[PDB]
């Protein structure tokens, strides 16, 4: 199975510029870091869980924090993109756990945040005082605020006194039964309505 | 170029009685008219199988095999017979592997080329450096036109620890011909086996000798390999009493008498 029946030599792409493009990307990143100093080179990203049943075991960085997450962390939505926080209005919080995890992430970032005043001679109450403005800082939010546990721990120890009893009848039997009711959910309802109609007719 | 030999207008004159059926340049009034075109056997034509840029130029090598080869080259660099067999001049070297104190290379001690040169003559790499100095020759062939004018031998390779010895020794040793420098954590097989030949002469610093074990303990996915032979002395193995005590008596000599 070789697909060479078109004019394939007209659009052959070679990659001799791979090291040069790496050099160009590194120079661009250095320029961006120098322009953005002392801010980090990237924005804070939330922790989200991958879709589909294949990848829902693993978490990763998402686009931005939700408005509910920002409101529960006390960060206004207009201030958030100005202090290194990415905002995503499309994502919603369907469960408490991801919402709470991202809110704690935002609180940790806000606790570690140093905010310089807009005017040096007129500091405000929301700004970091000059005696606390000096510390060891980080320039990579993807490294300092990475996904520490993408997967659940694969090994845990318990005593044999607390071994669970298990599903009555067996796990295999439970799976077969659940599939059986999932396939027969409509038939039972139809026969129940038929029996109810017959009972109403001949009560 | 992809269009070389194809920027002509030419058609074959057909089967006839006079000329070969090669395509010929049309028109008139010039020498090119009527001359053959498009053939690899023709002057001013396209070559057979024109070379392309999508030829495979780079070879993917397993990192484990690279690390194996680097370990083997470093092991061969500590064998003084192989250093002489690779053409290095090490007859005045006090010990192989040659380890120099880091106090003589750290900071700006050998940041000057004169100081580096004096240190080399003190430690005994001087005859080999002089060999490289005297071996300069002009290249035979078109490499002279293509930017490769001179050829010379390879001198000593100084391996250092950048964290403890600094990096001014690189500037110090740069201008000496044949003298190469390398960090202990980025060792290069192209330097350790020049031309695929084992036994490079290496000047070590004490910091690099201390850090070499950490360097091979920090390589993930790689361990120092297990040899398939435990005792490399075949003479000791064969002439040991354990083998000789169970041998059969010899059935002949090295030379056999002619019977008839």
């Amino acid at each position: 199975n070789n697909h060479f029946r078109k004019h394939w030599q007209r659009r052959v792409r070679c990659h001799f510029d791979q090291p040069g493009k790496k050099v160009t990307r590194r120079l661009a990143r250095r320029a961006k870091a120098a322009a953005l100093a002392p801010r980090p080179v990237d924005k804070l990203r939330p922790i989200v869980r991958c879709p589909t049943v294949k990848y829902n075991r693993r978490t990763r960085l998402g686009r931005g924090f939700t408005l509910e997450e920002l409101k529960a962390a006390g960060i206004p939505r207009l201030l958030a993109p100005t202090i290194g926080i990415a905002v995503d209005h499309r994502r919603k919080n369907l469960s408490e756990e991801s919402l709470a995890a991202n809110v704690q992430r935002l609180k940790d970032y806000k606790a570690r945040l140093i905010l310089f005043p807009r005017k040096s001679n007129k500091p405000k109450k929301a700004d970091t005082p000059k005696d606390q403005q000096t510390a060891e800082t980080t320039t990579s939010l993807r490294t300092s605020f990475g996904v520490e546990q993408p997967l659940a721990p694969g090994f845990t120890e318990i005593s044999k006194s607390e071994i669970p009893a298990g599903i009555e009848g067996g796990a295999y039997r439970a799976l077969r039964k659940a599939r059986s009711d999932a396939r027969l959910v409509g038939v039972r309802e139809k026969r129940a309505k038929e029996k109810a109609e017959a009972e109403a007719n001949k009560k | 170029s992809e269009k070389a030999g194809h920027q002509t207008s030419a058609e074959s004159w057909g089967t006839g009685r006079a000329v070969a059926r090669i395509p010929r340049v049309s028109g008139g009034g010039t020498h090119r008219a009527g001359q053959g075109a498009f053939g690899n056997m023709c002057r001013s034509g396209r070559m057979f199988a024109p070379t392309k840029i999508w030829r495979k130029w780079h070879v993917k090598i397993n990192q484990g095999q690279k690390r194996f080869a680097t370990a083997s080259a470093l092991a061969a660099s500590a064998v003084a017979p192989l250093l002489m067999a690779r053409g290095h001049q090490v007859s005045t070297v006090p010990e192989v592997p040659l380890v120099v104190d880091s106090a003589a290379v750290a900071g700006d001690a050998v940041a000057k080329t004169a100081a580096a040169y004096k240190l080399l003559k003190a430690i005994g790499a001087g005859p080999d450096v002089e060999k490289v100095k005297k071996s300069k020759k002009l290249r035979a062939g078109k490499g002279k036109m293509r930017g490769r004018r001179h050829r010379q031998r390879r001198g000593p390779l100084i391996v250092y620890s950048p964290e403890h010895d600094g990096k001014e020794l690189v500037k110090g040793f740069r201008n000496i011909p044949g003298v190469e420098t390398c960090p202990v954590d980025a060792l290069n097989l192209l330097q350790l086996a020049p031309g695929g030949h084992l036994g490079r002469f290496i000047v070590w610093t004490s910091a690099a000798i201390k850090q070499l074990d950490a360097v091979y303990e920090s390589k993930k996915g790689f361990f120092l390999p297990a040899n398939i032979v435990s005792q490399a002395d075949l003479s000791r193995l064969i002439n040991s009493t354990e083998i000789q005590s169970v041998l059969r008596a010899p059935k002949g000599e090295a030379r056999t008498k002619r019977a008839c």
Partner: protein, 133 residues
């Protein structure tokens, strides 16, 4: 070894630049060393050669000949020195082209611009020496 990316080690480009250099570049190319007395007087090693300089030839078949530079003929990269000539067949004299790297300057044709050149070269050499020492 060259380190800067604007420096080329191409022999083809170097020869093209050398043989197609304009006249002001050829003036700098056509430089000559000074004599030992001039070097210790001015703290200057080399200067471009011009008409009116006194030179001594130190290379070639006309070695140890001294004379004034009568022409700096930049088109074939040569100079003409007075009395360093040969005879054509017909008996007339034709000058012999000498490269400026084969002569040493013994007396400078001094003027305001030459003094400015010597002063700025000497000042640059001295400040380089103080910076590196």
């Amino acid at each position: 070894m060259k380190v800067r990316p604007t420096v080329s080690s191409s022999r083809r480009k170097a020869r093209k630049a050398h043989f197609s250099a304009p006249s002001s570049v050829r003036r700098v190319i056509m430089s000559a060393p000074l004599s030992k007395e001039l070097r210790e007087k001015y703290n200057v090693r080399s200067i471009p050669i011009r008409k009116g300089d006194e030179v001594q030839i130190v290379r070639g078949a006309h070695k140890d000949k001294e004379g004034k530079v009568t022409s700096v003929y930049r088109l074939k990269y040569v100079i003409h020195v007075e009395r360093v000539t040969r005879e054509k067949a017909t008996g007339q004299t034709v000058p012999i082209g000498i490269h400026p790297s084969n002569v040493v300057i013994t007396k400078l044709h001094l003027d305001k611009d030459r003094e400015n050149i010597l002063a700025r070269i000497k000042a640059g050499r001295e400040q380089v020496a103080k910076a590196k020492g």
